[PDB]
């Protein structure tokens, strides 16, 4: 049974774009139907890493449930997670992707954080996250309070260290900033470890799934 994505793109649906709860959360599909010009996708501008690969790996799915990998209300006691952006506005008001959280400073501080998740679900788990690139050094300090920040995602198959590239860009939707989006597959049994002292757009929901 095919999966209609409406006016949304694979990026938008899987990220949890606010203009993308739209649609009939489905549990299985054979192929993915997507308009050539979808209007609400990566609402906050930025590059989605390895996008064609993700569309293929998701082209065929037999089971699919969303679940809250890092619960919004218990995972982040030392960080503000409320931040929203006018670029992701639902019904007029500013908002954000439902599956990610924009972690920002709290009490004037952004402490080193590290949270992990072990796959116990007997299914492949799809994990998405972003890294934020502010357009100038004033924004970097305002959001994370440090000029030299790092993000490091490390699992058994994935090992990357992101440093934010801070500079002026051309404007997409009046934003000069970028969030770069990233994704890895989590084997039943594997564990993924996030470490950062800024710029992490942390995962909130992930997906368990299979392909036949």
């Amino acid at each position, epitope marked *: 049974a095919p999966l209609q994505l409406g006016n949304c793109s694979v990026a938008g649906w899987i990220l949890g774009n606010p203009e993308c709860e739209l649609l009939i959360s489905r549990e299985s599909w054979s192929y993915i139907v997507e308009k050539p010009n979808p209007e609400n996708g990566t609402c906050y501008p930025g590059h989605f890493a390895d996008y064609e690969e993700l569309r293929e790996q998701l082209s065929s799915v037999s089971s699919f449930e969303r679940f809250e990998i890092f619960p919004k209300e218990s995972s982040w006691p030392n960080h503000t997670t409320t931040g929203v952006s006018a670029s992701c506005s639902h019904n007029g008001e500013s908002s954000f992707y439902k599956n990610l959280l924009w972690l920002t400073g709290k009490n004037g501080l952004y402490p080193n954080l590290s949270k992990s998740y072990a796959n116990n679900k007997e299914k492949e788990v799809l994990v998405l996250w972003g890294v934020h690139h502010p357009p100038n050094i004033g924004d970097q300090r305002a959001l994370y309070h440090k000029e030299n920040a790092y993000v490091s995602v490390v699992s058994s198959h994935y090992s990357r260290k992101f440093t934010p*590239e*801070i*500079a002026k860009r*051309p*404007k997409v939707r009046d934003q000069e900033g970028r969030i770069n989006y990233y994704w890895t597959l989590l084997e039943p049994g594997d564990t993924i470890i996030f470490e950062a002292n800024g710029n992490l757009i942390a995962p909130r929901y992930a997906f368990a799934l299979s392909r036949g």
Partner: antibody, heavy 126, light 108 residues
Framework: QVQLEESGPGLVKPSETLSLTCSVS??????????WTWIRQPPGKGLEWIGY???????NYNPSLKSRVTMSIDTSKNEFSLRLTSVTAADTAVYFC??????????????????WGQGTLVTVSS | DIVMTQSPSSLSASIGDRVTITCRPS??????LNWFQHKPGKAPKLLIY???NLQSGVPSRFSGSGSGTEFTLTIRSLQPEDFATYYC?????????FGQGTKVEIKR
């Protein structure tokens, strides 16, 4: 907020090498998120992209010109340069330097120069 | 290698008029299309990037539209300072290539 000042001969004799410099002010030529570009416009024709160079070393030159152009970065002077060999009257043009900001989601690599200098005219003549 | 055709090559319009310039790539380029403005003796300025995003400092009477194989820059009410030559530029495959330009003059 960034300035790009172009400099160079104005007159080049045919077959000789044209050299131009763009002195960059307001950012560092070593910041790896930007790339540096040259563009030209022959009299009465359209704009023709020459190439981009990133400080980390990745470069790409227009295939129409790739066998005659090289670009370089001089960190000591916060400059970058264009060298064009074996020129003819077809190379008479206003040459623009430009900065771009890498943004692969909205632009291919090195292809959206968004701060241009105002250009310097080079006339090829003997 | 992607060839850009802009139309028309020249136009005149009165103050307050709605002006429209079209751009046609030689193959489909999605949203990877930018618009530049070049006023006399000045540095070229990026007005619209990725088909429809108004760049900072650009007045909101400028808007870009289209995708795929037809693109449009519209000026909803011409002003004297909008005298310039406008160019489209595809950012879809390298090398970046430009249209021949549309020179806009005013009628007063």
């Amino acid at each position: 907020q960034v300035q790009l000042e172009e400099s160079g001969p104005g007159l080049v004799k045919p077959s000789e090498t044209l050299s131009l410099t763009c002195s960059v002010s307001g950012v560092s030529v070593t910041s790896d998120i930007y790339y540096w570009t040259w563009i030209r416009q022959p009299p009465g024709k359209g704009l023709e992209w020459i190439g981009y160079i990133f400080y980390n070393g990745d470069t790409n030159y227009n295939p129409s010109l790739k066998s005659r152009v090289t670009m370089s970065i001089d960190t000591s002077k916060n400059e970058f340069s264009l060298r064009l060999t074996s020129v003819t009257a077809a190379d008479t043009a206003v040459y623009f330097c430009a900065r771009g900001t890498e943004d692969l989601g909205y632009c291919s690599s090195g292809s959206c120069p968004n701060h241009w200098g105002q250009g310097t005219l080079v006339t090829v003549s003997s | 290698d992607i060839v850009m055709t802009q139309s028309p090559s020249s136009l005149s319009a009165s103050i307050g008029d709605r002006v429209t310039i079209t751009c046609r790539p030689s193959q489909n380029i999605r949203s990877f299309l930018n618009w530049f403005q070049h006023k006399p003796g000045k540095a070229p300025k990026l007005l619209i990037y990725a088909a429809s995003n108004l760049q900072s400092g650009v007045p909101s009477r400028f808007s870009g539209s289209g995708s795929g194989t037809e693109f449009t820059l519209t000026i909803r009410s011409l002003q004297p300072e909008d005298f310039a030559t406008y160019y489209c530029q595809q950012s879809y495959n390298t090398p970046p290539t430009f249209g021949q330009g549309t020179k806009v003059e005013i009628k007063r």
